[PDB]
């Protein structure tokens, strides 16, 4: 039948090792260890009548899109014709019932103390409350938190290339749009591989890693389709999403709406190009590299990224960028 107790997904040892790693209107994301293996746990309240972080809770039906999308993107690491590891593994999904575990509140508190939270402390849920718990592969640390930690603009180039490739592969296989690819949703993890591999419509290629593997996460707003069945988040009646300021990020939401005429069911892979532009913009303006571009070779990489910034909005998809933009030649 129905939901399982929190303790089914989060036994004592696993709860004791939880550290909060991020948040959103949806809820909370923690890192922990499951079977000696780091994982990320995303916890979303469903079906209740309380306001949570300023919104009503989703119904089970309303969470299925994100579950579906998470599974599809996870599957791309093991496909053949259109293959990428540039999203994240989905290990499990559960529906749990209970009040919020005190140990997760303790982790929540530590995060609020050190980084600050925009969320309601999740301590008001009763013992009949339902949640969806998604357990993901642990993908490393977000680009925003790594903004002063990267080696050089060659590393930035790798990151852009990886992101563009991953998005292209998902466009080709799934008519995917991420739709919220701010720099908090780009993860970086060390790899000893010198080259990373992807396959796009049957053609395989490689990207120099610069020692990092990128994972694109958080599919709250994402869209895709399969066999003409579209799965998406309909934000056509959201006001607040389109009225932010203070960062180019908030312009991207408005520019998406302009591109799609507020019809979020449609496929508009230009949204992927918009997010990639926003990300290039962050690379050129808000990162501090450990090695400056004061050699001719590194200056040259900078000029290519500036050229990418200046021209990429004339491309129609991540696929168009990957296949045709001079940056990737
Ligand atoms: O919805 C998700 N994230 C939204 C909040 C940002 C947390 C960003 N930081 C990290 C750090 C490491 N990891 N590893 C996996 C994930 C993850 N997230 C992850 C996976 C799927 C969704 C989200 C997050
Ligand atoms: Na990944």
From Swiss-Prot:
Disulfide bonds: none annotated. Residues 15-329 form the Protein kinase domain. Changing residue 244 to F: Markedly reduced affinity for histone H3 and reduced histone H3 phosphorylation. The active site is at residue 180. Changing residue 182 to A: Strongly reduced enzyme activity, markedly reduced affinity for histone H3. ATP binds at residues 21-29, 42, 137-142, 180-185, 218-220. Autophosphorylated on both serine and threonine residues. Strongly phosphorylated during mitosis but this does not appear to significantly affect its intrinsic kinase activity. Phosphorylation by AURKB is required for full activity toward histone H3 at 'Ser-3' in mitosis. Strongly expressed in testis. Also present in thymus and bone marrow and low levels observed in prostate, intestine, lung, spleen and lymph node. Expressed in fetal skin, liver, kidney and small intestine and also in proliferating but not non-proliferating cell lines. It is found in: Nucleus; Chromosome; Cytoplasm, Cytoskeleton, Spindle. Changing residue 238 to L: Markedly reduced affinity for histone H3 and reduced histone H3 phosphorylation. Serine/threonine-protein kinase that phosphorylates histone H3 at 'Thr-3' (H3T3ph) during mitosis. May act through H3T3ph to both position and modulate activation of AURKB and other components of the chromosomal passenger complex (CPC) at centromeres to ensure proper chromatid cohesion, metaphase alignment and normal progression through the cell cycle. Belongs to the protein kinase superfamily. Ser/Thr protein kinase family. Haspin subfamily. This is Serine/threonine-protein kinase haspin. It comes from Homo sapiens (Human).
């Amino acid at each position: 039948k129905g939901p399982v107790p929190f303790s089914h997904c989060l036994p004592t040892e696993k709860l004791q090792r939880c550290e909060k790693i991020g948040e959103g209107v949806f809820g909370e994301v923690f890192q922990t260890i499951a079977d000696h293996t780091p994982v990320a746990i995303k916890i979303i309240a469903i079906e209740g009548p309380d306001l949570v972080n300023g919104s009503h809770q989703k119904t089970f039906e309303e969470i299925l899109p994100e579950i579906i999308i998470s599974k599809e993107l996870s599957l791309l690491s093991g496909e053949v014709c259109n293959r990428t590891e540039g999203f994240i593994g989905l290990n499990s999904v559960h529906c749990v019932q209970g009040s919020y575990p005190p140990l997760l509140l303790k982790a929540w508190d530590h995060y609020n103390s050190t980084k600050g939270s925009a969320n309601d402390r999740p301590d008001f849920f009763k013992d009949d409350q339902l949640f969806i718990v998604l357990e993901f592969e642990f993908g490393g640390i977000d680009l925003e938190q790594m903004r002063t930690k990267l080696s050089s603009l060659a590393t930035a180039k790798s990151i852009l290339h990886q992101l563009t490739a991953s998005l292209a592969v998902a466009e080709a296989s799934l008519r995917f749009e991420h739709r919220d690819l701010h720099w908090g949703n780009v993860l970086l993890k060390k790899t000893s591989l010198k080259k990373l591999h992807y396959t796009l419509n049957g053609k395989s290629s490689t990207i120099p890693s610069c020692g990092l593997q990128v994972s694109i996460i958080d599919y709250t707003l994402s869209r895709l389709e399969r066999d003409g069945i579209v799965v998406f988040c309909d934000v056509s009646m959201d006001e607040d999403l389109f009225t932010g300021d203070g960062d180019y990020q908030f312009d991207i939401y408005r520019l998406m709406k302009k591109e799609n005429n507020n019809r979020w069911g449609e496929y508009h892979p230009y949204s992927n190009v918009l997010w990639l532009h926003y990300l290039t913009d962050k690379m050129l303006k808000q990162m501090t590299f450990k090695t400056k571009c004061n050699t001719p070779a590194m200056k040259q990489i900078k000029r290519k990224i500036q050229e990418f910034h200046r021209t990429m909005l004339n491309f129609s998809s991540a696929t168009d960028l990957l296949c045709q933009h001079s940056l990737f030649k």
